[PDB]
DNA sequence: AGCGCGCCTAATTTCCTAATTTA
DNA sequence: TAAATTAG
RNA sequence: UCGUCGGUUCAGCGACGAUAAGCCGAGAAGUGCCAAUAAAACUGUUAAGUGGUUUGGUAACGCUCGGUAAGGUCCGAAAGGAGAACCACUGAACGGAAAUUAGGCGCGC
């Protein structure tokens, strides 16, 4: 398993931040120069290597055309000379991300289902494991040493050794960080990311852990239910236990940004003299804003949505999780009617509960709102969203999310359906 | 000059669905042939290509990348008409040339064309025919000389394609003659499984001339700050003082802080009625310019229950009136009394969210109300004949 | 007050190298 | 002696 | 009403800023515009027709980059001050980056 964390970066130790922001920008620059060269390169040999065969019935062999084994050593030799300034490793790396983006998806670039990679002005700044590295001084300060330059880039900029940073190591940072001095945690390739809001560099460190799991049984199942009154219901078939995420915070975040948004549209028609003339980015500024917010609450809002169901999937020790399979599913008329995020949702529950030892299927969603949790019986008459669940032949009556939320719990459920479709 | 616009093709009128989707997808597998291998020509041609591709293994004899490139791609794309084939390859050169500099500076990697792309029709090669029976036909040539004889289609291709409202009235002055074709693409698209002939027009706009016949209304409303109707046209515009609620909202909380401070709150407060005022005066002169209205009728000059409140009335009506003139446009002030009461569909005389008339029955917005009653030339003096 | 924009939002996949050798 | 290079 | 600082996100808190949904600078990769010039391609016995290319310049642009207000100690009459140097809360979370795709909108009227 592989996590990431963010490191706020505070004060070069041994430069100003006014030298430091200059060799990060020009940095970045080298990076989307590598990246897009890449791309071209391997394209050009993908077109080559088609050529070659029509005209002698066998596809060239890299080494003896390329010099190289792969068109990673080719991109490397021709980038390099032009992107001097980046360290060779971090060098390497950026590069292999282009190719192996171009190689995973060569059969779609022939096909013309998908788009050459082209990639944009503000990219983050590769680090090799063995290039960064992070110490704790005496007096309770976190610094890490961040080889970041080449040989002729540290002549010209002054720097002789490492560009040590100081990284604000708090609350749950600590622990990660504590893990990774001691050992049990260790660094893989990260990043410098550069965040335009509130203008501060951060350091992604991903880390490499083991995850303890507990034995936990297999037979007890929990459903996760996206019902339509209740974001989400929970239920269990051996336990007459339930739970469920009322989501009434979710309901009064887009009243305002929907008042927000409309009203900031109408206002582009009429607006000031400076809000035109400078680019597009200066123009959507106000929406760009706007739709940054709505991002990162859905973001906090799954986060807290999943931790709490796989939390509850442990107490009842539950060892397996079922969910409804949205690729088919398209007429969302759930609580969530803002078109919420459901395949961020979705992802931050399998790797939450995998991390704790569960196994999470996905069933498929049909005609499992309207089945019976206690005779079975399937009629479509009853598909109105009442609120309520009213059985003709059982005579059960329980909330609608909750009906639902038991017939996903129950293993092999679609099959079951499938077997009597009604 | 050059517009563009769908228009949705029915079914083939000489050959099956199933002839003429198998002829299309052909058509459109050697499109993507000579967008793709035409960046891989113009990728050589400005000498971007490595070392190994002029040593290893692998001037030209022609001009332009264009002429160099139709004739290598014209040996394999058989099918395509000769007009058509040089206008795909021209659309990927010239992306390639717009694009030169930055793929070479590392800011952009190659052109990408889709699987299905659209076809490519030059004027020349679809012509649109209206029968007799009001059926119309466009006639479409796609098919070279060796394609279409193997084919056995031994004319052009002609199709039935809807023409419904302002497609009509496109269609017809392009069959009068006002409208030209210039070109047009063959687009097909997976939601419905339906083929689309968009046709590109160029014509000459007409200036809207001022005629002192079609009076803009303006009335402060209860829900916004302005709503402006006219008679002659049914279409509205609003403005809505968004801005305004924020920034009154804004100045309480600074009276309660700051509790020269209030000297300096009340300059700003004067600055941000000046710049409402002048942003709102040009969008409303802008507005009677685009439709050519020759008059502007705005109630003459409290604050009431007004969107507005307590707001600088006096200047907005001054910076109307003189933007006004500079456009030609002549204002009049009329007597507002019941003008919100009056029904604009049947002018009897009688919830402020929304106007309803007890006879008439029209149900609307009680600004949008108000200001079309405004927007009568002859308003003032009907004001009284109720009474 | 319809029936074409362009494009935004959500869905979706991949990845998060090492071993050797100049300096 | 950490940066450089290339193979699988 | 929005926003800034208190390790990130979302909420409050303490302080503060706001015409910020505001005001500006430089530049020439791209789209329009102005001068000069008229290629590729096709229909053509021809005559000739469609088609709009190339080099400069300009700076209107949802052109491209950027600047601009906001915690408390401190100096500074105050403004202002060289990311100067110290100090700064409560709750719930804490796996991130890049690329692509295809649909339904909000404008469009
Ligand atoms: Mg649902
Ligand atoms: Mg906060
Ligand atoms: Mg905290
Ligand atoms: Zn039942």
Excluded at 126 to 154: C, F, Q, T, W
Excluded at 164 to 177: D, H, P
Excluded at 198 to 224: A, C, H
Excluded at 320 to 347: A, C, H, K, V
């Amino acid at each position: 398993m592989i996590k990431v964390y963010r490191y706020e970066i505070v004060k070069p130790l041994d430069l100003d931040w006014k030298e430091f922001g200059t060799i990060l920008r020009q940095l970045q620059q080298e990076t989307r120069f590598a990246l897009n060269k890449a791309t071209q390169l391997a394209w050009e040999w993908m077109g080559f290597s088609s050529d070659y065969k029509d005209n002698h019935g066998e596809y060239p062999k890299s080494k003896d055309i390329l010099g190289y084994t792969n068109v990673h050593g080719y991109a490397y030799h021709t980038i390099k000379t032009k992107a001097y300034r980046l360290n060779s490793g971090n060098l390497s790396q950026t590069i292999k991300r282009a190719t192996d983006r171009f190689k995973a998806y060569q059969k779609e670039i022939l096909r013309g289902d998908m788009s050459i990679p082209s990639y944009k002005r503000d990219h983050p700044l590769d680090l090799i494991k063995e290039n960064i590295s992070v110490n704790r001084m005496n007096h309770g300060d976190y610094i890490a040493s961040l080889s970041l330059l080449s040989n002729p880039a540290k002549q010209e900029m002054n720097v002789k050794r490492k560009i040590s940073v100081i990284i604000i190591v708090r609350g749950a940072g600590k622990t990660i960080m504590d893990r990774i001095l001691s050992g049990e945690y260790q660094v893989s390739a990260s990043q410098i990311i550069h965040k335009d809001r509130k203008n501060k560099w951060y350091l992604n460190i991903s880390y490499r852990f083991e995850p303890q799991t507990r034995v936990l049984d297999l037979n007890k199942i929990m459903g996760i239910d996206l019902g339509v009154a209740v974001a989400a219901y929970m239920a269990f078939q051996h336990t007459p236990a339930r739970y469920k995420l009322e989501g009434g915070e979710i309901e009064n975040f887009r009243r305002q940004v929907e008042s927000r948004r409309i009203s900031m549209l109408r206002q582009g028609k009429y607006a000031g003299g400076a809000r035109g003339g400078h680019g597009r980015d200066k123009r959507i500024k106000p929406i760009e804003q706007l739709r940054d917010k709505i991002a990162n609450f859905r973001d906090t809002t799954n986060h807290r949505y999943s931790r709490y169901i796989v939390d509850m999937a442990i107490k009842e020790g539950c060892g397996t999780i079922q969910m409804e399979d949205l690729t088919n599913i398209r007429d969302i008329g759930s609580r969530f009617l803002q078109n919420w995020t459901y395949y961020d949702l979705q992802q931050k529950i399998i790797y939450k509960a995998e991390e704790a030892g569960i196994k999470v299927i996905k069933i498929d969603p049909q005609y499992t709102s309207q089945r019976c949790s206690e005779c079975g019986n399937i009629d479509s008459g009853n598909r109105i969203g009442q609120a309520i669940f009213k059985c003709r032949a059982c005579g059960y009556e329980a909330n609608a999310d909750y009906n639902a939320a038991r017939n996903i719990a129950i293993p092999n459920i679609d099959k079951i359906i499938a077997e009597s479709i009604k």
